[PDB]
Amino acid sequence: DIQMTQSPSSLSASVGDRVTITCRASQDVNTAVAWYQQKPGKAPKLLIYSASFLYSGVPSRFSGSRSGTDFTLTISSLQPEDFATYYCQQHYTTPPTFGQGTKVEIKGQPKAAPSVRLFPPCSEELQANKATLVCLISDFYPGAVTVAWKADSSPVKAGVETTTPSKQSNNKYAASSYLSLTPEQWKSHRSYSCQVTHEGSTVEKTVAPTE
């Protein structure tokens, strides 16, 4: 079964950059290769077929080429409507297969540092022998964030559930991290800590059972 290896998985580019995306086919596929663009919540749109033929209505700053089993999509000068995910696909044999995708992202304006807000358990959960620490992370850009939890000062990996960052309406990002505990666990430690690191700045917040 023929695999398409796409590189890189992600790229932040400026409007006007020459951008190149590469697909390695696992075995020979001739020139039976298409490229697609997909925007969030939409269907993929065909860009290039038979390795290098530009589909009707696609701007000419797009092109595709081949060396061996290496396939390449070039965008001569990135435009705003080009920020998107791109996928290659071989259609040489059945089944046809796709690359994993390359996300071409905006190299964003000044960063914004996250607000971190960390809450201890509810009574209602304690009384039902459950406990949840809730770490809410808002108003950050870019949308990449490292969440670390600590008990006293020991790293805690167990029972962490963290969302993928999603764009607020103000175009900054938010995310949530939940640490599930038993009451026993909660009471066993002096403090717990939610640590958020973003673009080289660490925001730590802590909560204690003894008030």
């Binding site: 039976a32 298409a34 697609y36 939409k42 269907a43 993929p44 749109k45 065909l46 077929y49 038979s50 589909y55 996928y87 696909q89 259609h91 059945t94 089944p95 046809p96 297969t97 796709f98 690359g99 994993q100 995708g101 807000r117 809450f119 509810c122 009574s123 209602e124 959960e125 949840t132 809730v134 809410l136 808002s138 559930e161 963290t162 969302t163 993928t164 999603s166 938010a174 995310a175 949530s176 939940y178 008030e211």
Partner: protein, 215 residues
Amino acid sequence: EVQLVESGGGLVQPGGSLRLSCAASGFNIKDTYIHWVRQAPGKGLEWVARIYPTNGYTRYADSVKGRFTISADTSKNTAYLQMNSLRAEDTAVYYCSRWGGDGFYAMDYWGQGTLVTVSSASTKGPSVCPLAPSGTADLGCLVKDYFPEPVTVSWNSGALTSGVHTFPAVLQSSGLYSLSSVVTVPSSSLGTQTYICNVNHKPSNTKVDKRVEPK
């Protein structure tokens, strides 16, 4: 105008069954192959099946054989995917697609996609509890362990709008959702002003209120 329109899709249980449709217009199916392609949330595209409606010749991907059946219908200009023995990992957006014609084997037209969720989780309203606050303070409501999406959260029956931030839900390893909603309020309002979060989970026909108080 060539168009492909899909219908069906939704939540189903593992073991269960669903049928998708792909109504073409602007061309004749018979002139080309119709495909199904699917996209697990946050992942790539995975081809699923294909049919030449002129004769009904099908092909399938291994992960679906003996489970899914693609079929077509001349008269109604329509392709179908019958999905049985569903598993959690068939969760995806399902697209239908065509080749062009003759020797043009790229997918030039795609339908808009339709989401299929496969989960063993049972319908359930959330356990809500208040997140007590320690210029301004932060207070909130934890909306725990519901299924399926979505929930709507208001404060003071929709009257309290400034400082309100309702967060996207986490899907937990258990297969249930939790989320939180917070309000930033004047510290001088604490212990005096009434703050109520109102949580509505239509799928379980459940509305819950909780008053949030300092401690």
